[PDB]
Amino acid sequence: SFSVEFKATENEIVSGKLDADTPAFHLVMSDSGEHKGWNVRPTGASEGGQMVSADGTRVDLHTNELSWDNDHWWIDDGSERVEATFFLAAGDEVKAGEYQFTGRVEEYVETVINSKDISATKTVKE
Amino acid sequence: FSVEFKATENEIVSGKLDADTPAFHLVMSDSGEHKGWNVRPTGASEGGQMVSADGTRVDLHTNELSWDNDHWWIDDGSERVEATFFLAAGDEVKGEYQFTGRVEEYVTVINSKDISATKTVKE
């Protein structure tokens, strides 16, 4: 009954300084079974909380739906479904590229009971 | 803050150049808040030049960075910026050429580091 969906968002991003908080990824973590909360842990290139392009350029990710603890996002949410959007901050100077985020989702109980890798790429146009 | 500076891989042979020829590659990166970067030639390289053991001075050029009298600079807030320094076409080149410089990150310089690399022009 545990499922995750992680996709790049539909909004178009162009290189240059962002006027506004700009959506990049959307995440959905589901389970109707009893649980305490979730972890979203960056992996590989994306460690630190970044999306990373082919040449290695990094862009920080932010979410208003999840808390952060040193190196990963977390939330105590026992509902059947949690959603989170990861956005780029306003004022960030972003270069063109195909930026990939990799990470591992973890469901925990009042102890991790389910985990799964996520991976998505968002385009920044020139 | 990280800096990477190296000779390019293309072979250069002595004589007078036809087109523009890559000589070095530079990567300046920092995840911290910043306004831009300076690349300041130091030592024998002052003037923006690579210099061989016999004292032959060859001009460097870049289309990725701006120039201001005696140094390159760029306003770039992104986490990472790359530059290729090339020799101009029509330049006579004779050895082992060293460029020495200092990379600076500014907002006021908040990080800096010496860079050095040697490029071979063969007979």
Chain B positions touching A17 (Cβ under 8 A) are 77
Torsion angle of C-alpha atoms A61, A63, A67, A72, degrees rounded to 10: -30
**What resolution (Å)?**
1.5
Q: Which helix (H) or strand (E) holds A72?
A: strand A72-75
Q: Which of B54, B111, B58 is nearest to B85 (CA)?
A: B58
At CB < 8 Å, which residues of chain A contact B?
17, 48, 50, 55-60, 92-95
Q: Tokens standing for B106? A: 């500014």
Output the DSSP codes for A20-60.
S-EEEEEEEEE--S---EEEEEE-GGGTTTEEE-TT--EEE
Experimental method: X-ray
Q: Identify the domain containing residue B122 by its residue range.
A: 1-123
DSSP at B88: P
Phi, psi (deg, nearest 5) at residue B43? 65, -140
Residue with tokens 């009298």: B69
Closest approach of A24 to chain B, Cα-based (Å)? 17
Query: Into how many domains does chain B fold?
Result: 1
Q: Which of A33, A1, A23, A24 is nearest to A116 (CA)?
A: A1
Distance (Å, rounded) from C-alpha B50 to C-alpha B44?
8
B73: left (phi over 0), alpha (psi -120 to 50) or beta: beta
Residue B75: give its domain's CATH number: 2.60.40.3590
CB-CB contact of B45 with B120 (8 Å): no
